[PDB]
Amino acid sequence: DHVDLPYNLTATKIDSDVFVVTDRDFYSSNVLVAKMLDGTVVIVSSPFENLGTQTLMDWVAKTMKPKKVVAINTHFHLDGTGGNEIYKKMGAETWSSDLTKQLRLEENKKDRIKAAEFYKNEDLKRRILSSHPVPADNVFDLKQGKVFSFSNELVEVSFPGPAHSPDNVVVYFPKKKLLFGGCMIKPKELGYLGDANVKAWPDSARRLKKFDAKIVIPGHGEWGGPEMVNKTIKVAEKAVGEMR
Ligand SMILES: O=C(O)[C@@H]1C=[SH][C@H]2[C@@H]1C(O)(O)C2(Cl)Cl
Ligand SMILES: [Cl-]
Ligand SMILES: [Cl-]
Ligand SMILES: [Cl-]
Ligand SMILES: [Zn+2]
Ligand SMILES: [Zn+2]
Ligand SMILES: [Zn+2]
């Protein structure tokens, strides 16, 4: 059961006050939206650009009516920082690691038109170039992580080590037993390897086994239970082996 939104987003209820919003135009990217017991809404990751993000925020506004929104970037890629322009414009409080902010600014130095070449889809290319990704307004030291407390309901952000990217963090909701693992959760294949640390990935994923989690949410594709971590570890080990 899902609700269809503008620009090919879909919202699925996966629990009480917990939804996954998926951007099916841009690699089926997952965005977690969780309403805290005290009414604060927490958003993890983002759609790639301004139309998807505005659609997301409209739906959050209508269906949850929050007084406060906290948005947490999972890494510097567009499924991660692409929502910041609109989150900030809508009044949300945007957070990321210091390294994530740094890499986002670095990536922005690059020539967009030469960079966005690798879409081929003219409609998507125009949407991409009409957005201009910015870093979060608030930062924490990567290796220290960050803990939010919303009337004693906790949201924990931590760095398990480099894997999909040098800066990838996970977000854990203890009361709801929910882990958003993002793009280091890769149960079938590793995907985009450009910013990846394949050698370090198996131990980085092993660090996620400690979480008491009934649900694990990956950056792309269908979510699952704690077995998502086990599969990832095996996929990561296979790659290390093949490349020696
Ligand atoms: O490995 C991933 O996480 C993904 C594979 S395709 C897509 C996504 C991403 O890195 O955001 C691109 Cl390369 Cl745009
Ligand atoms: Cl800019
Ligand atoms: Cl803290
Ligand atoms: Cl308690
Ligand atoms: Zn549908
Ligand atoms: Zn990524
Ligand atoms: Zn991704």
Numbering used by the authors: 32 to 54, 56 to 61, 61A, 62 to 207, 214 to 224, 228 to 251, 254 to 265, 294 to 314
Wording from the paper:
Like other B1 MBLs (NDM, VIM and IMP),10 SPM‐1 has a binuclear zinc center, but has loop characteristics of the B2 MBLs, suggesting it is a B1/B2 hybrid, which, consequently, may be challenging to inhibit. SPM‐1 is distinguished from other B1 MBLs in possessing a “wall” of hydrophobic residues involving Phe57 and Tyr58 on its L3 loop, Phe79 on the loop connecting α5 and α1, and Phe151 and Tyr152 on the kinked α3 helix in the “closed” form, as well as Tyr228 on the opposite side of the active site cleft.
The resolution extended to 1.7 Å for uncomplexed crystals and 2.38 Å for inhibitor soaked crystals. Wat1 “bridges” the zinc ions and is proposed to act as the “catalytic” nucleophile.10a Relative to uncomplexed SPM‐1 in the same crystal form, a small (∼0.5 Å) movement of Zn2 into a more solvent‐exposed position in the active site is observed; however, the binding of 1 does not cause significant structural effects on the metal center with little change in Zn–Wat1; Zn1–Zn2 or Zn:protein ligand distances. Notable interactions made by 1 are in the vicinity of Zn2. The C4 carboxylate of 1 makes direct interactions with both Zn2 (2.48 Å distance) and Lys219 (2.91 Å), a binding mode likely involved in substrate carboxylate binding in most B1 MBLs. In contrast to previous predictions about cyclobutanone binding to MBLs,14 the Zn‐bridging Wat1 is clearly present, potentially interacting with both the C6 oxygens of 1 (2.7 Å). Binding of 1 involves hydrophobic interactions with several of these, notably involving sandwiching of the bicyclic ring of 1 between the aromatic rings of Tyr58 (consistent with the 19F‐NMR results) and Tyr228, and edge‐face interactions of 1 with Phe79.
